Amino acid sequence: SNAMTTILPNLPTGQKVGIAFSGGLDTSAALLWMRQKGAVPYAYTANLGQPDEPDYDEIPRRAMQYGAEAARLVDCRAQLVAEGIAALQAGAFHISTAGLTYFNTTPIGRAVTGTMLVAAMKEDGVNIWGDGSTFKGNDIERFYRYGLLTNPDLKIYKPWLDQTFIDELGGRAEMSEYMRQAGFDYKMSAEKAYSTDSNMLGATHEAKDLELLSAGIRIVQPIMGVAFWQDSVQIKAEEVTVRFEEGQPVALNGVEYADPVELLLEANRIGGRHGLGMSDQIENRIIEAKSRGIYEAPGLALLFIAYERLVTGIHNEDTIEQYRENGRKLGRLLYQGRWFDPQAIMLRETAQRWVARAITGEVTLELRRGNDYSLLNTESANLTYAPERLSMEKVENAPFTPADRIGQLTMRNLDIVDTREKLFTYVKTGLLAPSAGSALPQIKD
Amino acid sequence: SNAMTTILPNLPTGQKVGIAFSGGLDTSAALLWMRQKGAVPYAYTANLGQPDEPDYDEIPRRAMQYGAEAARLVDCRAQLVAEGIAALQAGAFHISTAGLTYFNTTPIGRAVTGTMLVAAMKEDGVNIWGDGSTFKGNDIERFYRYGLLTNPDLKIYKPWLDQTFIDELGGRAEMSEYMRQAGFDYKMSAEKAYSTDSNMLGATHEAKDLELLSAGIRIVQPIMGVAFWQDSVQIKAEEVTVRFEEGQPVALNGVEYADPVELLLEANRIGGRHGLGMSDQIENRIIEAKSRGIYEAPGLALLFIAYERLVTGIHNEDTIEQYRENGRKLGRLLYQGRWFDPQAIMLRETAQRWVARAITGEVTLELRRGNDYSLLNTESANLTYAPERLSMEKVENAPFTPADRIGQLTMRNLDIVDTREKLFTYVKTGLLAPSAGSALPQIKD
Amino acid sequence: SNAMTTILPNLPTGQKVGIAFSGGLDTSAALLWMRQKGAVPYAYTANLGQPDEPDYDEIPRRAMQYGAEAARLVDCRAQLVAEGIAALQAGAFHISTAGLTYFNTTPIGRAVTGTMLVAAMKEDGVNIWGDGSTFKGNDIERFYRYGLLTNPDLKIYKPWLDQTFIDELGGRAEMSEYMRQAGFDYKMSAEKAYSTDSNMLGATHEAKDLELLSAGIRIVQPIMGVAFWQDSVQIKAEEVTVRFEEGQPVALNGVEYADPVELLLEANRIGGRHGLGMSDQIENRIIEAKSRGIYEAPGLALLFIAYERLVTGIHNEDTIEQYRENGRKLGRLLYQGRWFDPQAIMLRETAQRWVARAITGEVTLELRRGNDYSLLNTESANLTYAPERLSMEKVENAPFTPADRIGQLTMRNLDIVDTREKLFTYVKTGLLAPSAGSALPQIKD
Amino acid sequence: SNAMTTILPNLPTGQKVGIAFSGGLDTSAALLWMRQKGAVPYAYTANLGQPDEPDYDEIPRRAMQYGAEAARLVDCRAQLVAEGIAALQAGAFHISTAGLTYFNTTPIGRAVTGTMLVAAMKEDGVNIWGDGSTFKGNDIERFYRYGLLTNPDLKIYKPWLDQTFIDELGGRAEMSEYMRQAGFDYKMSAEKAYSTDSNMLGATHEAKDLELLSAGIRIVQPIMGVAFWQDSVQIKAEEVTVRFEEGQPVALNGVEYADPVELLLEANRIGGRHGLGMSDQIENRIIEAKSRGIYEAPGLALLFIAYERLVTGIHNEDTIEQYRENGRKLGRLLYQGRWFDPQAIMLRETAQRWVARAITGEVTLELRRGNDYSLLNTESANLTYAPERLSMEKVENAPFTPADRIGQLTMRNLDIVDTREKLFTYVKTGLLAPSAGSALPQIKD
Ligand SMILES: Nc1ncnc2c1ncn2[C@@H]1O[C@H](CO)[C@@H](O)[C@H]1O
Ligand SMILES: Nc1ncnc2c1ncn2[C@@H]1O[C@H](CO)[C@@H](O)[C@H]1O
């Protein structure tokens, strides 16, 4: 080991140690433990607009009760929405099943907190991050990378590498006990059949009973919308308009939003009433092993429909093709924690400039249950869709004549003959089966 | 002009002329007109398992009443399903809107009839095809290519290039009159606000009122399913199991199908009861102008869900990535009429072999209305999804340790520093905006 | 036909007609003919820095002798070099044979003259271009597109569609005669075994004897360099330094160039003395038929070596991969005449910004004959190549330890087992042949 | 730590340990040391047709002198050539500088020895490989993967993790001393300013003085060819013919080769006399850090020219595009040690079937010095290059007319107008700079 080794396996006694303080059991016990053992902890709670968080202000207050040197709320909502919109603009979603898309809400979230919490730590003179992200997940890598990109002098302390931490804490029962012995009644929540990670872009549910592919969405109580699959849940058809100005979502139902955070919060409400955007995916972790999740993203799903519809009516085939190619590649880079790397920047800026800036328009749709919806109208001054330009009603307005089309067809013949000749060559070399045959099963070569 | 000139602008009097005889007004009047003018027409009606065709046998019988020299039914169902399954296996679908996919059912249909009807014509000594496909659509090019690939000596007569055809026929009122004057009361079907093309893979609706983006699925009476968007339409939730064996769909609801045509007919019934698979798309025609359609494909949509789900649980990330890249490229080639060209064969065979052959398994789902469904179970002996291999419960079974993961992280540092340095270089050259700023809007460079 | 039909098949008598006046036989005879027949011709001669053009000023003077209403020289050199540099920066070259690259000098040239000559015509109130580009080449399409993009009201008159032009002119002997009968002794050049098209980016040789693949570079007298393959040609080894600043070539042999045109002219001289950059290619024309050429581009070949070398020492693997992917796609768009279309802009700007702006450095090489050269040095403050950062000499400076690498390897096991299991599955389904076998040829399944 | 832990940090005393015995100082001392310490070593020497190996038979004989339990020569030449030919067919080369290509000869070599030596070990009941491949290179990962794919029960002992090995051996002086103390005067070869790895596909030189980019090919004494850059080296121009049959190289200079190993040995001799194929590359290692090499591959370079030339004359543009796209992706997978993984198989088989099987023909060239050569002839019954099919000499043979081409142009107008309108939209949103300007530098927005 040396001075520039990033990972610290032992608690840095007497030093300032930053903690991404969500206020759950793990971070609460860790913070208390770090103080007890001699470190000086600084708590940073990310305000991510979590749909299941009732009161962010209460969290720093508990950090101080547990002995934090300082505790603050870092507002990450604006950035989260801006990165979410950038991902949307670039179609940066690589996880999908028969078209149903996962909007990479977890990786976007990590890109935001990994950079913003480390920067907040740096401003307070905190160059050590006591990051509990586990050895078997994706976040250990994402946070490692985002952290070091933000603060080159960052050291990362991994408590689970410290035998004293493993012995005194460990499982949830031991951590819950450690809290109680220090005089803090940690209000243990009612246990669920899965784990949840959330932010205002979306929520992901996985692990525990969701590890079995025989279980699924039926066991999930959604936190950003209703259980649309249950008959007792009454959902009436609802018309919605979504308006974009140069790629930025600016209005919902004719109401203009100067604040994009407020706009996404309203998109979330609209999609949420219908259960729009939920999916079930098997994803490939960074370590090359699969995991399974149930996902929610009602607001982004709503915006995705409108943005895509406009893209298909505004951009040419090659542009749409590059957009989709770039997006799948960018999605994977995002998932790996490389959202700010040069290769990702290239893909991202290309979409923000040449694809998104032309997207000025409005899409009208009807939402019913889950992903059942209908398109009602699509409007844009930038549309290239124009059946009137294809009108052959008058000879004076027709773009081309029947004779012109025949001329175009004649240009295909040379390559057609080349292809037919390839087919015959492929039969002779045994790659393709001959055209003609027998009326009964036949003997092969 | 030249002996190898494909297009004939004049009726070839006294010669054998093939007609793709659907039996609608256009082909009925054309066939009668061609006979009256001296040509010898041969009618070929493609049995495509059309969902709106009540009796295929009656069509050749009418061709003979109109003076056809001969009239045959060419059974294209087996081939249509085989090509549909190949497309499915290769994810050869390039037209989509926010994930909702068009299954290229029209282009697959043309690849089958364009080759099979021309081959049937050749057997009867017919080397001229009186093809009415219009000068402004995609099919004129698709049929031109498929036809010439099948029969190098094929000539194509386009009635609309013949001034005598334009003068005597033309609009539907003139054709309907021509029928009546020849003693045939052509029972014209009730007029619709759109045109429909169909086969057992799917149905497409476009033109007329569907040209307006302010109109949509609401004006369409579906022919392969119910009007799922109307509240008065009662749809009961339904559980379905779909089983694949080495990429081929072999069973539905535990019932094994030796005949793939019968299997797709049942898949169509199941999906049809729910309205599964309908979408609204703006597509890019071969001529680089956009058109709009409302699409149906209930059976293929059902199979796509199952196939995709299995692919995500069986194949590694690079394999899935190549599969999807190849599919979007292949979809476009298919749409262009290049399904049998070498570049298409490459993409297609790759999927049929290395992607599809590993797809042995069964997916269980619940269908509700439209594209609202839930996954209930996923089973396969070929799954690489395996949370038990990730289990750290025993030291003797864990694939890696916490210390091993730290080792992996340390391997990232060199490139992380390179990326951070790129970011600083990009700020200096003015490509990226600086990190730090002011509390109020600031003057830029 | 209608008012917005671009192509005019008849000479527009009494109207202003622009001619891209190169001053060769075709344009000289056409200009004279157009005046004689009543049109009012305006001549525009592109100054392209042609290596075989001794005096551009003399050309407009001849246009006026032939009866041009006006004649001017449009300087296209600055733009030609800027577009050439942009292509270079984006590696926009899709035609190559075993790595030997064609720098798309003809298509770049057409993008420049097609836009610039049409703009010059517009400023003089000339909205008709009498473009002689032939019906069987690529340029007819390129000029059509570039012209209409530049001037939406442009009409293009194609003399070869005019029966009066075909009758009075036609072959070279007839045109040469037409000149003589009008009192102009057109000084007919000594005939060559091939046709040449050139500009300061490069020169292309094709047609006539070069149509035979049994002929090649041996019959070509190069115009931008020496015949390096001939023993009588003495070529001494020469050291050269090429320096870039943020992607722009700025110095050669320590001499800084404020004018990029002068820099390329010197690069051409340096590469030309050695015959650097020549190649033999079979390309695919827009009409899907092949053509063959012998190419020269000594200056661009020199710059390409230096730029590429720097790219490989500065950018990460993913960045280089996107750069090369984008370049091959962009090259094809360029060749089609779509250099200014949105899909091309995307690819081009991406390279100019994220790839090229980091390319600040200097490459030293030794040129011998043809493409035989050696790299002597590569320097750049932006290099990520840094063997000293990989030095394990001191424990205090090593980036990772041996134990760290072992940790990284353990992360591969799960996918390795999945791959081995796929291999066994592929043998069972018959896709792959088993590993073990017999000592003699064996019977198959 | 775990029964399936691959890496062994301690010498397995009393157990059978396989050693890839090249017979250099490192493997000689290691083998002797392992025996002395109680292990039972089995030596396997790969016959790779190394250009610098004078006598393979002498190596096993020395292994036995040093105390090997058994020592065998495993003939890897046939497989090496077959994998080399497969790579060639698929253009699986991703490392290049201005077109000059590195033929991935080291990674191909590792794929062959990593699998073949492990299989040979298994036959002898040896399930432990004492692999000295270092902690900072690529081969540690390649061998790890190839080994485990071949033998799932393989354990890999890394001597450098054993403190007893580090203490007693270590540097070359210590190993050379250990040999002498055991009674073996190891005749150390003359020291070089770089390290070399070789096989009959090619040779790579790197490390030591080649780490400096100010040094290069000038300090290398080539082992597969002459020092073509030195004037004193006399090289006579030489004509060569290379013939392929369905993608397999079968003849050189009219002499047919039934044995591909013999064919490559002759190709190596021909290219070697000229120094054909040498290059200087900066590559990206698996660990995301760069390294520099000087490479030789005269035989493969010769075959690459012929294969590529034939590909350009036989295959259509889309086919060539897919071929090159697939190749760059496959090259990277090959470099990573994933040559036998599913995603690599897909790319590889596609080329072997649809690209290579059509490559039947012969290319004639003249080789001079280094990469300076000329193409003299290209012949193939499969060529699609055919200027006679483009001949407009007779009206009865012309594929299209001038009027037909005009028809084709008219089909471009709609998209041209869409693109022009995009350009105006991009100026309005500030993405593109306006067309018109001032005669002097102007104030911007
Ligand atoms: N036409 C296309 N060609 C290749 N890849 C495409 C295309 N369209 C979209 N993609 C996407 O490219 C991704 C990776 O490049 C794939 O996941 C695929 O979905
Ligand atoms: N890694 C890669 N994957 C795919 N295509 C690539 C890669 N590198 C370069 N290319 C280029 O992409 C082009 C078209 O996309 C091909 O002509 C090919 O040369």
Side-chain angles (χ1 to χ4, degrees), chain C residues 6 96 135 137 144-145 211 218 290 308 312 315 321 324 341 366 385 405 408 412-413 415 419, chain D residues 96 98 135 137 141 144-145 211 218 290 308 312 315 324 332 341 366 385 405 413 415 419:
Chain C
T6 320
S96 70
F135 81 103
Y144 190 84
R145 195 179 196 87
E211 290 196 346
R218 282 177 174 175
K290 294 169 181 294
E308 280 262 309
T312 62
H315 288 298
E321 189 176 275
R324 294 194 171 129
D341 286 72
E366 172 176 288
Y385 174 77
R405 194 68 189 272
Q408 192 269 123
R412 304 302 193 191
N413 295 62
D415 181 69
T419 286
Chain D
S96 70
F135 81 103
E141 203 163 319
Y144 190 86
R145 195 181 195 86
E211 290 196 334
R218 281 174 174 180
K290 295 169 181 294
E308 280 262 308
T312 63
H315 287 298
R324 290 185 171 145
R332 185 173 186 173
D341 285 72
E366 170 178 286
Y385 175 76
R405 195 70 186 274
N413 294 61
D415 182 70
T419 286

Coordinates of all heavy atoms in Angstrom, one line a residue, chain C residues 6 96 135 137 144-145 211 218 290 308 312 315 321 324 341 366 385 405 408 412-413 415 419, chain D residues 96 98 135 137 141 144-145 211 218 290 308 312 315 324 332 341 366 385 405 413 415 419:
Chain C
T6 N -37.4 20.2 -60.8 CA -36.0 20.7 -60.8 C -35.3 20.6 -62.2 O -34.7 21.6 -62.7 CB -35.1 19.9 -59.9 OG1 -35.8 19.6 -58.7 CG2 -33.8 20.6 -59.6
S96 N -11.2 1.5 -48.6 CA -9.8 1.1 -48.2 C -9.6 -0.4 -48.6 O -10.6 -1.1 -48.8 CB -9.6 1.2 -46.7 OG -10.3 0.3 -45.9
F135 N -25.2 10.9 -66.8 CA -26.3 10.1 -66.3 C -25.8 8.8 -65.6 O -26.6 8.2 -64.9 CB -27.3 9.8 -67.4 CG -26.9 8.6 -68.4 CD1 -27.5 7.4 -68.2 CD2 -26.0 8.8 -69.4 CE1 -27.2 6.3 -69.1 CE2 -25.7 7.8 -70.3 CZ -26.3 6.5 -70.1
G137 N -22.7 8.5 -63.7 CA -21.8 8.7 -62.6 C -22.4 9.0 -61.3 O -23.6 8.9 -61.1
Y144 N -26.9 17.6 -57.7 CA -28.4 17.8 -57.6 C -28.7 18.2 -56.1 O -29.4 19.1 -55.9 CB -29.1 16.5 -57.9 CG -30.6 16.6 -58.1 CD1 -31.2 17.1 -59.2 CD2 -31.5 16.2 -57.0 CE1 -32.6 17.2 -59.4 CE2 -32.8 16.3 -57.1 CZ -33.4 16.8 -58.3 OH -34.8 16.8 -58.5
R145 N -28.2 17.4 -55.2 CA -28.4 17.6 -53.8 C -27.8 18.9 -53.2 O -28.4 19.7 -52.6 CB -28.0 16.4 -53.0 CG -28.5 16.3 -51.6 CD -28.1 15.1 -50.9 NE -29.0 15.0 -49.7 CZ -30.2 14.4 -49.7 NH1 -30.6 13.7 -50.8 NH2 -30.9 14.4 -48.6
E211 N -10.0 0.4 -66.5 CA -11.1 -0.4 -66.3 C -10.7 -1.9 -66.2 O -11.4 -2.7 -65.6 CB -12.2 -0.3 -67.5 CG -12.9 1.1 -67.4 CD -14.1 1.2 -68.3 OE1 -14.4 0.3 -69.1 OE2 -14.9 2.1 -68.1
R218 N 1.0 1.1 -62.6 CA 2.1 1.1 -63.6 C 1.9 2.0 -64.8 O 2.9 2.5 -65.4 CB 2.5 -0.3 -64.1 CG 3.4 -1.1 -63.1 CD 3.6 -2.5 -63.7 NE 4.5 -3.2 -62.8 CZ 4.9 -4.5 -63.0 NH1 4.3 -5.2 -64.0 NH2 5.7 -5.1 -62.2
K290 N -19.8 -1.4 -59.3 CA -18.4 -1.0 -58.9 C -17.7 -0.3 -60.0 O -17.9 -0.4 -61.2 CB -17.7 -2.3 -58.5 CG -18.3 -2.9 -57.3 CD -17.7 -4.3 -57.1 CE -18.2 -5.0 -55.8 NZ -17.8 -4.3 -54.6
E308 N -3.5 10.2 -36.7 CA -3.9 8.8 -36.2 C -2.9 8.4 -35.0 O -3.4 8.0 -34.0 CB -3.8 7.8 -37.3 CG -5.1 7.8 -38.1 CD -6.1 6.8 -37.7 OE1 -5.7 5.6 -37.6 OE2 -7.3 7.1 -37.5
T312 N -4.1 7.5 -31.2 CA -3.8 6.2 -30.5 C -3.1 6.4 -29.2 O -3.1 5.6 -28.3 CB -3.0 5.2 -31.4 OG1 -1.7 5.8 -31.7 CG2 -3.8 4.9 -32.6
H315 N -6.4 9.0 -26.8 CA -7.7 8.6 -26.5 C -7.9 7.2 -26.0 O -7.1 6.3 -26.4 CB -8.6 8.9 -27.7 CG -8.9 10.3 -27.9 ND1 -9.6 11.1 -27.0 CD2 -8.6 11.2 -29.0 CE1 -9.7 12.3 -27.4 NE2 -9.2 12.4 -28.6
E321 N -12.8 3.6 -30.7 CA -13.8 2.7 -31.4 C -14.9 3.5 -32.0 O -15.3 3.3 -33.1 CB -14.3 1.7 -30.3 CG -15.2 0.6 -30.8 CD -15.5 -0.4 -29.7 OE1 -14.7 -1.3 -29.4 OE2 -16.5 -0.2 -29.1
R324 N -13.7 5.5 -35.0 CA -13.6 4.7 -36.3 C -15.0 4.3 -36.8 O -15.2 4.3 -38.0 CB -12.6 3.6 -36.1 CG -11.2 4.1 -35.9 CD -10.2 3.1 -36.1 NE -8.8 3.7 -36.1 CZ -7.8 3.3 -35.4 NH1 -7.9 2.2 -34.6 NH2 -6.7 3.9 -35.5
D341 N -26.1 16.8 -44.5 CA -27.4 16.3 -44.0 C -27.2 16.1 -42.4 O -26.1 15.9 -42.0 CB -27.9 15.1 -44.7 CG -28.5 15.4 -46.1 OD1 -27.7 15.7 -47.0 OD2 -29.7 15.3 -46.2
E366 N 10.0 9.2 -40.9 CA 11.0 9.1 -42.0 C 10.2 8.5 -43.2 O 9.7 7.4 -43.1 CB 12.2 8.3 -41.7 CG 13.1 8.0 -42.9 CD 14.4 7.2 -42.5 OE1 15.3 7.8 -41.9 OE2 14.5 6.1 -43.0
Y385 N -0.6 7.7 -22.8 CA 0.5 6.7 -22.8 C 1.5 7.2 -21.8 O 2.0 8.3 -21.9 CB 1.2 6.6 -24.2 CG 2.4 5.7 -24.2 CD1 2.2 4.3 -24.2 CD2 3.7 6.2 -24.2 CE1 3.3 3.4 -24.2 CE2 4.8 5.3 -24.1 CZ 4.6 4.0 -24.2 OH 5.7 3.1 -24.1
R405 N -4.6 -7.8 -8.8 CA -4.9 -8.4 -10.1 C -5.6 -9.8 -9.9 O -6.5 -10.1 -10.6 CB -3.6 -8.6 -10.9 CG -3.9 -8.9 -12.4 CD -4.5 -7.7 -13.1 NE -5.0 -8.0 -14.4 CZ -4.3 -8.0 -15.5 NH1 -3.0 -7.7 -15.5 NH2 -4.9 -8.3 -16.7
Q408 N -9.2 -9.2 -9.3 CA -9.8 -8.9 -10.6 C -10.2 -10.2 -11.4 O -11.3 -10.3 -11.9 CB -9.0 -7.9 -11.4 CG -9.7 -7.3 -12.6 CD -9.5 -8.0 -13.9 OE1 -10.5 -8.4 -14.5 NE2 -8.3 -8.3 -14.3
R412 N -14.1 -12.8 -13.0 CA -14.4 -13.4 -14.3 C -15.1 -14.8 -14.3 O -15.8 -15.2 -15.2 CB -13.2 -13.6 -15.1 CG -12.3 -12.3 -15.4 CD -13.1 -11.2 -16.1 NE -12.2 -10.1 -16.5 CZ -12.5 -8.9 -17.0 NH1 -13.8 -8.6 -17.0 NH2 -11.6 -8.1 -17.3
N413 N -14.9 -15.5 -13.2 CA -15.4 -16.9 -13.1 C -16.8 -17.2 -13.4 O -17.1 -18.2 -14.2 CB -15.0 -17.6 -11.7 CG -13.5 -17.7 -11.5 OD1 -12.8 -16.7 -11.5 ND2 -13.0 -18.9 -11.4
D415 N -19.0 -15.8 -15.4 CA -19.3 -15.7 -16.9 C -18.5 -16.8 -17.6 O -19.0 -17.3 -18.6 CB -19.0 -14.3 -17.4 CG -19.3 -14.2 -18.9 OD1 -20.6 -14.3 -19.3 OD2 -18.4 -14.1 -19.6
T419 N -20.1 -19.4 -20.2 CA -19.6 -19.6 -21.5 C -19.3 -21.1 -21.8 O -19.6 -21.7 -22.8 CB -18.4 -18.7 -21.8 OG1 -18.9 -17.4 -22.0 CG2 -17.7 -19.2 -23.1
Chain D
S96 N -4.8 -0.5 -35.3 CA -4.2 0.0 -36.5 C -3.9 1.5 -36.3 O -4.4 2.2 -35.4 CB -5.2 -0.1 -37.7 OG -6.3 0.7 -37.5
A98 N -3.3 4.8 -39.0 CA -3.5 5.3 -40.4 C -3.5 4.1 -41.4 O -2.8 4.1 -42.4 CB -2.3 6.2 -40.7
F135 N 1.5 -10.1 -13.4 CA 0.4 -9.4 -12.8 C 0.0 -8.1 -13.6 O -1.2 -7.7 -13.4 CB 0.5 -9.2 -11.3 CG 1.4 -7.9 -11.0 CD1 0.8 -6.8 -10.6 CD2 2.8 -8.0 -11.0 CE1 1.5 -5.6 -10.2 CE2 3.5 -6.9 -10.7 CZ 2.9 -5.7 -10.3
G137 N 0.3 -7.6 -17.1 CA 0.1 -7.9 -18.6 C -1.3 -8.3 -18.9 O -2.2 -8.3 -18.1
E141 N -4.8 -12.8 -17.8 CA -6.2 -12.9 -18.0 C -6.6 -13.8 -19.1 O -7.5 -14.6 -19.0 CB -6.8 -11.5 -18.2 CG -8.3 -11.4 -17.8 CD -8.8 -10.0 -17.7 OE1 -8.0 -9.2 -17.1 OE2 -9.9 -9.7 -18.2
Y144 N -6.0 -17.4 -18.0 CA -6.9 -17.7 -17.0 C -8.2 -18.2 -17.6 O -8.8 -19.2 -17.3 CB -7.2 -16.5 -16.1 CG -8.0 -16.7 -14.9 CD1 -7.4 -17.0 -13.7 CD2 -9.4 -16.4 -14.9 CE1 -8.1 -17.2 -12.5 CE2 -10.1 -16.6 -13.7 CZ -9.5 -17.0 -12.5 OH -10.2 -17.1 -11.3
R145 N -8.7 -17.4 -18.6 CA -10.0 -17.7 -19.3 C -9.9 -18.9 -20.2 O -10.7 -19.8 -20.1 CB -10.4 -16.5 -20.0 CG -11.9 -16.6 -20.5 CD -12.3 -15.4 -21.3 NE -13.8 -15.4 -21.3 CZ -14.6 -14.9 -20.4 NH1 -14.1 -14.2 -19.4 NH2 -15.9 -15.0 -20.5
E211 N 9.8 1.4 -24.7 CA 8.8 2.1 -23.9 C 8.9 3.6 -24.2 O 7.9 4.3 -24.1 CB 9.0 1.9 -22.4 CG 8.7 0.5 -22.0 CD 8.5 0.3 -20.5 OE1 9.1 1.1 -19.7 OE2 7.7 -0.6 -20.1
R218 N 13.8 1.5 -35.6 CA 15.2 1.6 -35.8 C 16.1 0.8 -34.9 O 17.2 0.4 -35.3 CB 15.7 3.1 -35.7 CG 15.4 3.9 -37.0 CD 15.8 5.4 -36.7 NE 15.7 6.2 -38.0 CZ 15.9 7.5 -38.0 NH1 16.3 8.1 -36.9 NH2 15.8 8.1 -39.2
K290 N -2.1 2.0 -21.7 CA -1.5 1.8 -23.0 C -0.1 1.2 -22.9 O 0.6 1.4 -22.0 CB -1.5 3.1 -23.7 CG -2.9 3.7 -24.1 CD -2.8 5.1 -24.6 CE -4.2 5.7 -24.9 NZ -4.8 5.0 -26.0
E308 N -8.4 -8.9 -49.0 CA -9.1 -7.7 -49.0 C -9.4 -7.2 -50.4 O -10.6 -6.8 -50.7 CB -8.3 -6.6 -48.3 CG -8.5 -6.7 -46.8 CD -9.5 -5.8 -46.2 OE1 -9.5 -4.5 -46.5 OE2 -10.4 -6.2 -45.4
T312 N -13.2 -6.6 -51.9 CA -13.7 -5.3 -52.5 C -14.2 -5.5 -53.9 O -15.0 -4.7 -54.4 CB -12.6 -4.2 -52.6 OG1 -11.5 -4.6 -53.4 CG2 -12.1 -3.9 -51.2
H315 N -17.9 -8.5 -53.0 CA -19.1 -8.2 -52.2 C -19.7 -6.8 -52.3 O -18.9 -5.8 -52.6 CB -18.7 -8.5 -50.7 CG -18.6 -10.0 -50.4 ND1 -19.6 -10.8 -50.5 CD2 -17.5 -10.7 -50.0 CE1 -19.3 -12.0 -50.2 NE2 -18.0 -12.0 -49.8
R324 N -16.5 -5.3 -42.0 CA -15.6 -4.4 -41.3 C -16.0 -4.1 -39.9 O -15.2 -4.1 -39.0 CB -15.2 -3.2 -42.1 CG -14.3 -3.6 -43.3 CD -13.8 -2.5 -44.1 NE -12.9 -3.0 -45.1 CZ -12.7 -2.5 -46.3 NH1 -13.5 -1.5 -46.7 NH2 -11.8 -3.0 -47.1
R332 N -11.3 -6.9 -30.8 CA -11.3 -6.5 -29.4 C -11.6 -7.7 -28.5 O -10.9 -7.9 -27.5 CB -12.2 -5.3 -29.1 CG -12.2 -4.8 -27.7 CD -13.0 -3.5 -27.5 NE -12.8 -2.9 -26.2 CZ -13.3 -1.7 -25.9 NH1 -14.0 -1.0 -26.7 NH2 -13.1 -1.3 -24.7
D341 N -15.9 -17.2 -26.9 CA -17.2 -16.9 -26.2 C -18.2 -16.7 -27.3 O -17.9 -16.4 -28.5 CB -17.0 -15.6 -25.4 CG -16.3 -15.9 -24.0 OD1 -15.0 -16.1 -24.0 OD2 -16.9 -15.9 -23.0
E366 N 3.4 -6.7 -56.7 CA 4.9 -6.5 -56.8 C 5.3 -5.9 -55.4 O 4.8 -4.9 -55.0 CB 5.3 -5.6 -57.9 CG 6.8 -5.2 -57.8 CD 7.3 -4.3 -58.9 OE1 7.5 -4.8 -60.0 OE2 7.5 -3.1 -58.7
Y385 N -17.5 -6.8 -60.0 CA -16.9 -5.7 -60.7 C -17.0 -6.1 -62.2 O -16.6 -7.2 -62.6 CB -15.4 -5.5 -60.4 CG -14.7 -4.5 -61.3 CD1 -14.9 -3.1 -61.1 CD2 -13.9 -4.9 -62.4 CE1 -14.3 -2.2 -61.9 CE2 -13.3 -3.9 -63.2 CZ -13.5 -2.6 -63.0 OH -13.0 -1.6 -63.8
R405 N -32.3 7.9 -65.1 CA -31.6 8.5 -64.0 C -32.3 9.8 -63.5 O -32.3 10.1 -62.3 CB -30.1 8.8 -64.4 CG -29.2 9.1 -63.3 CD -29.0 7.9 -62.5 NE -28.2 8.1 -61.2 CZ -26.9 8.1 -61.1 NH1 -26.1 8.0 -62.2 NH2 -26.3 8.3 -59.9
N413 N -36.1 14.8 -54.0 CA -36.6 16.1 -53.6 C -37.2 16.3 -52.2 O -36.9 17.3 -51.5 CB -37.5 16.8 -54.7 CG -36.7 17.0 -55.9 OD1 -36.2 16.1 -56.6 ND2 -36.6 18.3 -56.3
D415 N -36.9 14.7 -49.3 CA -36.0 14.7 -48.2 C -35.0 15.8 -48.3 O -34.5 16.3 -47.3 CB -35.3 13.3 -48.2 CG -34.3 13.3 -47.0 OD1 -34.7 13.2 -45.8 OD2 -33.1 13.2 -47.3
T419 N -34.2 18.4 -45.3 CA -32.8 18.7 -44.9 C -32.5 20.2 -44.9 O -32.0 20.8 -44.0 CB -31.7 17.9 -45.6 OG1 -31.8 16.5 -45.2 CG2 -30.3 18.5 -45.4

